[PDB]
Amino acid sequence: MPVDLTPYILPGVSFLSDIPQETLSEIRNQTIRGEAQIRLGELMVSIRPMQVNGYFMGSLNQDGLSNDNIQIGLQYIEHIERTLNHGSLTSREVTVLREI
Fold first, then answer.
1. What are the residues facing 45 on neighbouring strands?
2. CA nearest neighbour of 50 among 29, 65, 36
3. Is there a contact between 38 and 47 (Cβ–Cβ < 8 Å)?
């Protein structure tokens, strides 16, 4: 099921007002199913640990979206990448494994 997470969304900023941590808990459990779809309102996101190269964190589903949905998406995604693993790693910290 696509668990929508938009109770405190400010559609235009990178930060969130304050997320229920109990939601991040349920996200981490459904990613183990192999996919977890999060809807940031209209912004479609897909958190899942694709076991080839990459941990489970903010991945914006750009399919079918518009330019603004990409932008508000990626600022909230870079937020979610840190929020899915609190103080563990950043986007680029994982990306360099693939990039080098």
1. 38, 60
2. 36
3. yes
